Every structure is written in structure tokens, then in C-alpha cells.
Amino acid sequence: VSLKLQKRLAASVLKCGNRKVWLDPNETPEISLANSRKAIRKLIKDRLIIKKPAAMHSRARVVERKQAKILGRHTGHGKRKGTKNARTPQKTLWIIRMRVLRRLLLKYRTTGKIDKHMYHDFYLKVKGNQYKNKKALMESIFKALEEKKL
Amino acid sequence: TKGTSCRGTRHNKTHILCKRCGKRSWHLQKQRCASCGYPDAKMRQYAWGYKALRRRTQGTGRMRHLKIALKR
Amino acid sequence: TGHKGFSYKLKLGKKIHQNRGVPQWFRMKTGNTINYNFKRRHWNRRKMGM
Amino acid sequence: GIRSVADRIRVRMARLPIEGEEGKFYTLVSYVPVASFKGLVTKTVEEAEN
RNA sequence: CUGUUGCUUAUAGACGAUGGCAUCAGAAAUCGGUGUUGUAAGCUUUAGAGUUUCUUAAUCAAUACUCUCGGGUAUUGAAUG
RNA sequence: GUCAUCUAAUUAGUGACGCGCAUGAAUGGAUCACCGUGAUUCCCACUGUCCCUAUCUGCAAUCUAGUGAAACCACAGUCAA
RNA sequence: UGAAACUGUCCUUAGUGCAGAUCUUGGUGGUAGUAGCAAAUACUAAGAAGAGGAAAAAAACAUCUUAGAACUGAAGAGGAGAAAGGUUCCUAAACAACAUUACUUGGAUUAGGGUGAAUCGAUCCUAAAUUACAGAUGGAAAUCCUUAAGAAAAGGAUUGAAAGGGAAUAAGAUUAAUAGUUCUUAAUCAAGAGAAAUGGUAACAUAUCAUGAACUUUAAAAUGGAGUGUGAAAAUCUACGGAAGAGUUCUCUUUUCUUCUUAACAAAAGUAAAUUCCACUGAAAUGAAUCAAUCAGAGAAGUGGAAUUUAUUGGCUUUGUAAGAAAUUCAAUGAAUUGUGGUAUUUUUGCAGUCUUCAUAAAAAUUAAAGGGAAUCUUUUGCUCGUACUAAUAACCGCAACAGGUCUCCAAGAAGCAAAAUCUUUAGUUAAAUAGAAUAACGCAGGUAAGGGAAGUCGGCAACAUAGCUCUGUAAGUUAGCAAGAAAGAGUAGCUCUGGUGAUUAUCGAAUCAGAACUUUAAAGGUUAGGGG
RNA sequence: GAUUCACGCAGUGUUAACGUGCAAAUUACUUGUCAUAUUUGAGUAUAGGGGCGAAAGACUCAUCGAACUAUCUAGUAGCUGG
């Protein structure tokens, strides 16, 4: 007896696909008498129709690769495929750089470390690509403040 | 590609059923029936279409109100 | 189509009604030659042009 | 998979009477896993036990 | 007598044909010879750059040492039994 | 066409000469950088294109079970004079 | 054989004699049991039903369930629509015909059943365009005109979009099939019925509030594209704390895997990003600011406010809805739980300014407000039509179950610059013009090769070869922009480490770059991937 | 109206397959292209001495150096077959 109707009906009650439905291979006469959704529901509760579990997809292999690549295990020259600008965008490095440099100059001005005329002159120097990192700018600010008292 | 391939896009009707002759001859864009000559009051008949005259004319239908008149 | 006019659906329904065969009792009338309905069509065999 | 099979396989074929008709016989080839195939010869298995 | 048939038959072969054996028939493993590749899995050599963690024990660690001329395959159109 | 040049070898290519059958100026004359699934020639590299063919895999082709057409057809089907 | 009409002679009459016309119509042979039933990776075992796997292997066996093995690989062979189709949808009986074998299978035969809306669309509005009365023209049918010609229409007639505009519905469950349509619960909308206000300096604000006619104006509906930055949600990934179940477990693994959810409509604990305005004050020693810009005495920065946008109220968390639902477990209908984050990627969605045009990127229905001053909570109803199914390597167009063609929506992991090639997850399917045996020649598709290297040939046709990324380096010529990835050379793997690029006051987090030992089969090349002059 | 890759699209080459084909123009690799002179759905407009054409006498329902369809029409044939 073709159990296509019961396989399709169970897949809708179980809210799964037809591949996740399991009908008992030995109790075919009992299943084939279930000609309605209500009849299938009783068969489901009686454990004659169970829902198969999904196949396991382990991320352990992927987790190890990320852990190794955090230490730079595989990020060599022979494992780089995109251009230098593609892997690390050059424009976003500049957007970040003066989001850091200009945040420091606003903190220094608000703390009384530098005045408006000094802050303005350093603002155009930061924008002019003069200080590569935060430490380079802090050294210049410290160095320039000593000429203020001399 | 003028043969088999060009037939795939034919899914837009040109003619639909007409109200006066019942045939699928009502041109949608021209707003006239190719067969019975719609809104034109006179029925469309031509002497070169002698077969078209013997397919739809008097006596090809029920003759509901004229069969009694001639019998009377 | 899913969308259709009211008159078009009724003429669609009549085409369903006329796609039937001769009833068995009609075939048993005396002097009967009508055994099949030669005005029959199937959706995959002939399009009814409407 | 469909492309690779074991180089050597050990089987256990048992002639048995058919359950339906006892005068008819059928074979039942089964799988007997082994650690290695060294020293394994054609052994005829007659249990003959209560 | 001959042919069919069997050895999923060969020194043969598109199919027929042809060649061999048919109860001392045949087939099968296994075993030894003969080949191919290159030293299997487990534990040890602190092999071992170094970082951890006790504190100067451990852990992790490409590769490398012993067992190892190892392990695996080998008629399928190989050769004994 | 004649002279150089490219090759061992040049009805090919490039560069010159020009009474040019019958070139020539918006029927446009000359000039090319960039561009071209446009036409032609020569180099390096690479190779079964070739010397000269060998071999491997899949699908068929071969045989069998089921199923099963078509073009064509005066009649047909061995040669020499 | 056949079972009801027919014949001979004489005149008369003719649709009167067939081997051809590539003659017309119908039927039938050889070819011939021959060519074929070979694109789309693929099936195997056990059982059930069935006349339908038998047997000297007749080596193959349709359908359904389970197990194994697999394919589409999420821009799918997934889940849904528009056109087109029209009952192909579901169930049962049944297999004469059809699906190049067969069929218990079927989109095939027979018979029943199935499409439920105040909120989804048509209906309403107009766009390109289209058609009427009167008028003009014409021998004629008919043509022109669409507001101009009119005693016609406060103003301009008809039609024209199931992708343009548009009043209002969501979650859960249910059917063999319908569901923003039925049931439960929870809402929303429209048309009804029962001398006329305050507050804030101001921008502006008040559970309907707080009268507002003719007439007029304004705004909305209603308007290009590119690229950059960013707010928010979802998906993926990840940190922390567990609960429940499953897998592995002779070698280990505090391990791997799955669930931990929430609607329409409203509320206002807490709290964001961006833009535009308002009050104070008046900037030069000019400041303020972005990734870029850009702004200011017709007034900057600073402080304090106001408004709008952010997929319903008011954007996010939260709340009512509402846990009673749903999901994951446990027991034989009843019980358990349902924290908090991220300075990561993608998609969607808004916002902010920048660029671009000899391109400037629709209208109406409908609504609101203003100027003006004429006048003195409950309950009822919500009509007509569409609604099933495919939407395609089998429901559409191609004569067909045709490798052709046909407009869209949603979209996981690995790896990589990449929505690339390759593999897998949820979902779907294992059949999609038949199989078995042997492993001949000639073929179609994919390959390799000693020495030579275009000597083949009309012709390097076909194949081979280069190929990613980083550093160095790059000619003549030139319209001075290019040529240019010219040409040419070097490096690249694994393991163990070191340093640089930030936030908050030691912790927290991002992949990216550079460097050094050691080791090996000395490393882009599994796939993808420029031959050069 | 820069250079390329991808979803798609075309049709340079093999003058490969097939050529009583999957197909009355298709398939495979290769090649080109893959957003502004772009691709595309629906609506609508243009009709036969006419239309439309970045122009090939190209396209106008497998029909084009003048579509399809019906009538004149049993057009005419000093030519061919019976």
C-alpha cells in the first residue's frame, strides 16, 4: 500500500520536511488506516511516527582554523589571494585614524591641556597626514607644550 | 531564432470573445471585431466571403420569433 | 489565470460540463449509434481557444 | 561508497529451509568482520548445539 | 559418434568460430616464491625552535629516533603447493 | 616591376624609385598615439600539428530480453572486350 | 461461395472501355525485427501489496516503508506569484489505450469532493493613448474635431494600469484540498444613529476639545541616478550563565550537536543617532567641524531648549497583547524552563551632506491647513466579482513528458577580494526518450608521452604554455591623459614566537601588517587564474 | 559613454557535436560582453507602392527586392507531361 498520503500528512503535522518523517516499517497496516490529520496526530503521540533529527554540522574544524589564524599561523604570503587594498581597505584605515586622532584633540582641548589656537593648528596638522599613530601625536603635543613655557 | 525560440514569449492575447458573434475575434487594441463587425451597426458581410455568409446568417440559428411568423 | 471575469469563468465552467461521455442507459436505447462523445478534449491534448 | 569496496571480504553463507515450504531451500549470506585475513581458510560452521 | 551445455574456460574471440578440461572436473582461500611503493597504527629518543604553567615537574609543539628491509598490494591476462 | 632587408632558400613582409594600364585632395589627400572576438608578416616560449604513432578512461558500436521507424525502390544485381 | 433481383435481340441516349499524367483517394510490401529506445554522476539490501523473478543465473524486477550510498548546493532540481493553461488540485476504484521496456505509478480512465474577505485585489483615479451627440468634410462607405466651431458637456464628455496613486487585520489552530478569506483571541476603518480656550520670551505644546459658511491660496498624494559615512532591525559569527535531549567513547574528549520564540494594534520606566530652528552673548591672535566637505557680524563656537525622521502608536530595550500560544523535554491528559552582551560580516531600511546632466527625471482621485468673517462612550450596517492547481528538464509557447524560449519575491556554513569554481546544512529528489553480457575495428567526450620542436598546414587551425598576491623594475612612441599588469627579476609552506595599528580606568576587542628561529617532500596553482614582443 | 570579474547575454573560433537532430538553427568548450548609446515586463502608437530601419533590401506571426487571406479565376501559355 502506497503510504504517500500519510507521509505527506505527517510532514505537515510535524512541521518538518518529508525527509525528516519516520514511519514504522513493521506497523504498515496501522499507519495505512490513518486517512486524516486527526488520525496521524494519534499515531504521532503513540510514537509510531517520529521526527528524524537533523544531520550534525560541527564547527570544530572551523573553530580551530580561526584559533590558529588569530596567532597568524596560515596568514602567510602564499595564502593571500586578494590585493593589499582588498584585504585591508586603505580608505577605512584613514577614517579610523582621524576618528582616533581627532577624538584625542577634542579631549585635550576640553581638559585645558591645549587652547583653541593650539588645538586649531594641530587639527590641520592631523588632517595633513603628519602623525601616523596616537603615540606620535601625543609626543608632538607634549613636545610643543614645552616651547609654550620657554 | 525566428522559429522555435521566438514562440516562447507568446502569452499576451490579441483577440478575445466578442459580444455580438460569440467568436474570439474581438481585437483588444483596435476595439473592433474582425468577424461580425462590432460596434458598427451593420453586420460585416462581403461578397468575396460567400462561405462566411453561409456560416452565420438567417436560418443558421434557432429563429425563435420568425419560425412562427412565416408559419402563420 | 487566477484572476478572471465573471462571464469568463461561467464559460470556463461550461467547458468542464461538456467534457463528459454518453451515460450507460442512453447507449442501451433501441437503434442507438451514439457510443462516444466526439466533442471531447483534454487539457494536454487540445486547447479550446478561449 | 559506490567507487570503493574492501579488498577482501569474509562471508558466512547458511543454507536453510524456506519458512513457507520446507522442501525448498535458500541461502543467507552474512558479514563476519575480522581483524585480519591472515591464516583464514574455508571453515565449515556446524554449530549442532542445544 | 556429433552438437547443445558447464569451467561467469584459455594460447582464441565483434557474434559464430577456434583451442583445453569435464569426477583423478573445476573453483576457492591460505602458505611459500616473485614483484611495486618506501618504514604502517601504539608507546619511547627531554630528538626538537619556543610559549606556557608549577617552580627550575609538567603541558602544547612542524619535523625526527627504536620497535621497522616496516606496513599495504600482488593476477586481475603471474608462478608452486 | 627594379634596389636593399628579412631566410640556407622569399610570387610572402618591410623599407625605397616612379609618365602612376587607371593615385590624388570634405566621392576628402597625408599623418596613428589609445583602442579592435578586424586583415598581413616576423621573433621568444610551448607543445602529437608533424617525424610516427603508442596507450588510458566514459558513452555507444557488437550480442541478447522487451519495443521498434525512415529515405529510397521499372526489374534487378560478378567481370573483359 | 453467395441469398433477391436479373437477362438476350432491335432502335435511341451517353458522365461509355486506362499501365503511365511527381496523376487524385484509400489500402499495402521490400527496406526490417534493421537504424534506433546512449546529454541531465546512481543505485543497493530487507519487508509489504500484487497474476506479474521466474531460474540449468532468465546476471536486469515497476510501486510503497526502513537502512546504506548519493545529487540540486541555496542567483537551488527549495518555498511562492504575474501572463498563459482550465479542473490538470484531493480521494477512492480500476490499468483496454498513452508516457520509444514494463508498470500495482501517473499531469493517463471512471466517480465523487474541493476555491468562504468590510481590512488581499478588481471595482475608484488618471498617464501614453482611445471613442461618442452636435459641427466640418466626402459621390461613397466613412473621415476629421475631444473643447474648438454648440442655447450641449460651477466647468468640461467616454475608455484607458490585478507592476503607477489607493481608508482599514494580525498571531495561533484547523481540511484528504481553502485560507492576511474558516475557528479562537485580539484590533482597525468608513457611513450613520443616540461673540466662541489656555500655556511658553521664542522655536512651539495641550485623553475630540477649545464654533467657523461662500470665496482664495498653500502643502501633501508627487517624482532621476551615482558614490561615501552612519543610526536601527534581521541573518550569520562570537563571549558569558545554565536547563533539556541526542552523538562519540577503548584512544582521548569538563567534548560535539539541537531548542531556549513572539504578531497586528496601543502604552510610556529607561535611553539613542542625525538634521533644522529658538533664547543669552557677540568671534580676528579667526575659529568650528567631516571619510570628503562645509559654515559664520542678514551672525560662528559655548550653555539651555523646541521640532521632525529612524519598517505601528514615539527609534531602541521594556510593557499590555501574552503565555493561556508556540518550541524543547518528562510521565501516563498532567508537569519543567525560556539571562545578559559584542569597538565582527552581510542584507534590508531610513538619514546626512558630495557629484552629474545642452537629461532636471508624471497627473488626477482624495486629504489637511491658512486668509476671511457668513450664521447663531454606546450601538447599527459594510453589497457584486476573483480566490482550487502548475508557474515549468512534465501543467505556459514551440504538433510531444521537445537539452529551445518566458517577468519577478524570500536566500545558511566552509574558503576566498569575490553572489567566482568546489564541498555541505534546511527543503526537494534518486526518476526524469529501457536494461544485461562481452570489453573487436571505426567513432563522440576527456587525457598522457621518449628525442626533435611548426620541419604539418592556405594559415600555430586544435592543443600546449603564462596565470593569484608582495617587493624591485619598466622602452620607443605620444593628443602629454597614456603605452603599462610593458618587458624583466626575486619572495610565498608547516610549527613556535615577537612587535605595530584602539576603548575605558589593569581589563576589554578587531583582523591586518612586519619581523625571527626550527622543520620538511622548499610551498599561488585541488578549483579559480593575463602567453609576450 | 575608464580596465576587469560575477548573475545574465551574445554568437568570434573549433568551419567540433548533430545534421531522417534535444532543436524547421540546438549543444559543448573557446571567445566577446556583462548599467547610462544598459537589460527588461505590461500598456499604447505606426499597416501593405504602407509601416519601421545606428541601413543588412534588414524586420513587419517559421511567409518579404513588396505580408497573409478571399474574389476576378478553371487568369494565359507558340512550352512540358498524359
What is the rounded CA–CA span in Å between residue D15 and residue D25? 7
What is the rounded CA–CA span in Å between residue C40 and residue C22? 11
Spatial CB neighbours of A148, under 8 Å, sequence gap ≥ 6 = A118
| B-to-C residue pairs, Cβ atoms closer than 8 angstroms | 4
Q: What is the resolution of this structure in A?
A: 3.1
3-state secondary structure A102-141: HHHHHHHHHCCCCCHHHHHHHHHHHHCCCCCCHHHHHHHH
What is the rounded CA–CA span in Å between residue B60 and residue A149? 119
The pair phi, psi for residue B45, each rounded to 5°, is -135, 140
Across the interface, do B24 and C50 touch by the CB < 8 Å criterion?
Answer: yes
Measured CA distances, C32 to A146, C21, C29 (Å): 124, 15, 6
3-state SS assignment for residue B15 = strand
Helix (H) or strand (E) holding C13: helix C6-17
Which chain C residues contact residue B17 at CB under 8 A?
Answer: 11, 50
What is the rounded CA–CA span in Å between residue A8 and residue C44? 27
Other beta carbons less than 10 A from residue A94's beta carbon: 11
What is the rounded CA–CA span in Å between residue A107 and residue A144? 17
What is the rounded CA–CA span in Å between residue B64 and residue C10? 24
- How was this structure determined? It was done by cryo-EM
Other beta carbons less than 10 A from residue B36's beta carbon: 19
Q: How far is the CA of D1 from the C1' of G330 (A)?
A: 40
The pair phi, psi for residue B68, each rounded to 5°, is -75, -40
Spatial CB neighbours of A5, under 8 Å, sequence gap ≥ 6 = A35
Spatial CB neighbours of D40, under 8 Å, sequence gap ≥ 6 = D10, D34
Strand partners, B33: B26
Length of chain A: 150
CA distance C4 to chain B (A): 13
CA angle, A55 as apex, A42 and A50 as ends, to 5°? 10
Strand partners, D25: D17
CA angle, C9 as apex, C6 and C11 as ends, to 5°? 110
CA distance C50 to chain B (A): 7
Return chain A residues 4..33 having CB < 7 Å to nucleic acid strand G: 4-5, 7-9, 11-13, 15-25, 28
Spatial CB neighbours of A102, under 8 Å, sequence gap ≥ 6 = A123, A126
Burial class of residue B44, CB neighbours in 10 A (0-12, 13-18, 19+): middle
Burial class of residue B32, CB neighbours in 10 A (0-12, 13-18, 19+): middle
**Cα torsion through B45, B46, B47, B51, rounded to 10:** -70
Which chain C residues contact residue B24 at CB under 8 A?
Answer: 49-50
Contact (CB, 8 A) for B34 and B46 = no
Burial class of residue A31, CB neighbours in 10 A (0-12, 13-18, 19+): buried
Alpha helices in A19-88 (DSSP H): 28-32, 37-45, 60-70, 84-87
What is the rounded CA–CA span in Å between residue A108 and residue A102? 10
Q: Are strands B32-33 and A21-23 parallel, antiparallel or unpaired?
A: unpaired
